[PDB]
Design a protein around this nucleic acid. Sequence first.
RNA 1: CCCAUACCCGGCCGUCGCUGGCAGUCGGCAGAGCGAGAAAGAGAGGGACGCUACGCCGCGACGAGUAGGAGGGC
RNA 2: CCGUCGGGCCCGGGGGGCCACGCGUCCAGCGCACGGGGUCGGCGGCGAUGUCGGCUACCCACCCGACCCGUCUU
RNA 3: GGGUGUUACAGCCCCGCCCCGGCAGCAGCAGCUCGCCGAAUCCCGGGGCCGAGGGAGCGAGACCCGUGCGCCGCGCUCUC
Lengths: 56, 19, 51, 216, 109
Amino acid sequence: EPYIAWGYPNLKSVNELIYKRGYGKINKKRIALTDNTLIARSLGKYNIICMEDLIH
Amino acid sequence: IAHPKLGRRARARIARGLR
Amino acid sequence: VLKKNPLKNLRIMLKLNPYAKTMRRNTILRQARNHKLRVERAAAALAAKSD
Amino acid sequence: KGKPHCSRNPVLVRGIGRYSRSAMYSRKALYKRKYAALATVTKPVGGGTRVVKLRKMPRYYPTEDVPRKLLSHGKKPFSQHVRKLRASITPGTILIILTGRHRGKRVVFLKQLSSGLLLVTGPLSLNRVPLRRTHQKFVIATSTKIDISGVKIPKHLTDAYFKKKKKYEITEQRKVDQKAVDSQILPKIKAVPQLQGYLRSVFALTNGVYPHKLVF
Amino acid sequence: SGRLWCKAIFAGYKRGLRNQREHTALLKIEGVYARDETEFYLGKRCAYVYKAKNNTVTPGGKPNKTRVIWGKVTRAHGNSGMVRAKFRSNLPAKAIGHRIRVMLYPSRI
RNA sequence: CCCAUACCCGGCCGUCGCUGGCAGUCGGCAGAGCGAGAAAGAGAGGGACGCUACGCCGCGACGAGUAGGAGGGC
RNA sequence: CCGUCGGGCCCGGGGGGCCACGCGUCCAGCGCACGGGGUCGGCGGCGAUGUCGGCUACCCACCCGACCCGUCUU
RNA sequence: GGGUGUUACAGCCCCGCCCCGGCAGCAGCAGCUCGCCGAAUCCCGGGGCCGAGGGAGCGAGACCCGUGCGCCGCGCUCUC
C-alpha cells in the first residue's frame, strides 16, 4: 500500500491507455501495437485479433 | 467467412456478388 | 515505425478500429440535431413570453 | 465517358463524409449496375538505313552515387500548399507594416494572392507605398473597414507581376496600375471623415503604451 | 518613426536554487504583471542589441558597430507577467538587467 | 506557479539480447516474392549500392561504482 | 398482476438509418489524402581592401557552480 | 427607543387539499449556487520543440523491358 496508487479504471481510461501507450511483449521485445496483425500474430489463438478484441 | 482454412468455399458468392 | 497517437491521428484509428469512423460519423448528426432542437427550444421561448 | 458529378456526399468533417459506404452504395445506384468482366527509330542516311536507339546510354559514371530516398507522402511542393488567412483580415481592412522599410506606415489591404502573400497597397498620395506584396504575419489587422467590394481589382496583376526579376526603375507598365485602382479608393478614403489623415500618420508606441493592454 | 519594439528586461537565466541552465532566458516584459496578459507576446520574436568595436555588416545598410542575437519567447513564467525566452546563442551574462527588444512582427492578430 | 542526471518523448554513443537477417549479385539458360492471424507446396505428372561473412544489416531493453575480475585497444 | 427509454439481429403479427444486393434446387482502371519518421516543382540579403567565416586551441570579462591532491581509515 | 402583540398600511415558517397544483427551464450564459463524468464526446484554434531513417517498388507479365507516389488503411469520379 505505501508504494502503489491503484484504483478501478474507467472504460474511457483504458480506451485512452491501450491506444496511446499500447506496447506488446513480442519475443521479449517491447514492440509497438500500431497494427492489428501483431495482436493477431501472438493472441490469435485466443480470438484476440484486433485492438478492440484486446479492450473487450 | 473470414476463415482461411474451412472458409475457402465460403468466400465464393461475394466474388460473384461484386460482378 | 513511429507509434502515432491513434486518438488525434484519424487514419491510425481507422487502421485499427474501422467502426470508429461510424462512431465518429455518428455523434455529429446526433449533436447537430441536438443543437438544432436546442435552438428551437430557445426560439419557441421568444414566441412564448410575448403572447 | 459521362458527366462527372461532384461528390454525392459532402465533406462533413475533414476526412469524413456525411453518408456511410452502405449509404453511398444506394446513392451511387450501383445495385442496378453490376459491371462484370518505342524509342528505336529507323532513319535513312544517303549506306542503307540506320536505327537510332534514343535515350542513348551514358558515357561517364561518377564513382559513387546517393541511393534513392524512401517514399513519403505528406510532403508536397509549395505551389500546392493550402493558403491560409486570418479571419480578422477582410478585404478593405487597414494594416500596419512592421518589418518592411515602410515601418508602421498605415496601409490598405486589397486581396490575397496565389502564393499566400497579400496585395496590400497604400495610397501613393498618402503613403508612398505602391501595389506591394507583404506576408500576413507582418500585419496589424485594424478593425477599420472600407467597402472596397465595389472596386475592380485588375486581373492582369498576379504573383509573377511582383517578382524581383533581376538597379530598380519603375517601369511604364507599373505606373498605369497604381493610378487605375487609386481612382476609386481615393474618393472613398475622403468620404470617411479624417481617414486620409490617418494613413499619412505612422504607427508608433509611446511611453506607458502596451499593445496587449490596448485594442486596435 | 517611433519605437516598434516593447521594453524587455533580462533578469537572469533559467535557474533553480543553486543551478542554472543558460539555454533559456527569463524576460520581464514591461507592462504585463500576470499570466493572463502574457498571451499576446507569446510567440513574438525577441532580440538583444549591443555594440562592439570591430565594424560588422548590416543587411541593408553600411557595416555598423552593432551586433544582435535573435530569439523568441517560449512560454509564460511564474504568475506575475514573467516569460521564458530561448535565443540562438545563450545570452552573455553582461546583459543582466539591460534592455532587449521584443518586436511584434510575428503577430497573430 | 517554481524544479532534480528520477519520469515521458526524440536525436546520438556503447553494451547486452534476439544464441537475430544477408552466399538470392538466383539477369535474353533472367522473370525481380516469402509481414502472413491460423500443423504444411507460387512443386512435377539492357538491369545502382553491396559481402575486410573477424564483414554488413535490423529491431527492442539497459548504462553508478572503490577493493577486485575480465575484455578490447589502427 | 404491475414495473423495465429491459433481453431475445428489441419474438412474431396487421421519419431516420444499414459494412444491405444476383439466379436455381433441396432440407477493372484513375486521381484525393489526419495513410510504413520532410519537403518546398518557395524565397530575400550583403560579399575586394575590410569585410565574411573559423567549435576548440591565446588573452580578457561576467553569471552560476566550485575547499588540495596522494594516502591509512567507519 | 421601549414593551404589548400574531400579518394589520411588511414579511418568515408549517400542514392538508389543489394531477408531484401547473408553467418555462435544466448540474442553466442569472459564463461562480453546490456534483460526478463521457461508447453518456466530438469539433476548432494558438505557441513551443524535433524531421531520425533513405533501392518500401508498381503493371505489361516469357502474348514484354516501361515506370518509380509504391504497402497497409479511408472514400473520389467514370464504364446508368
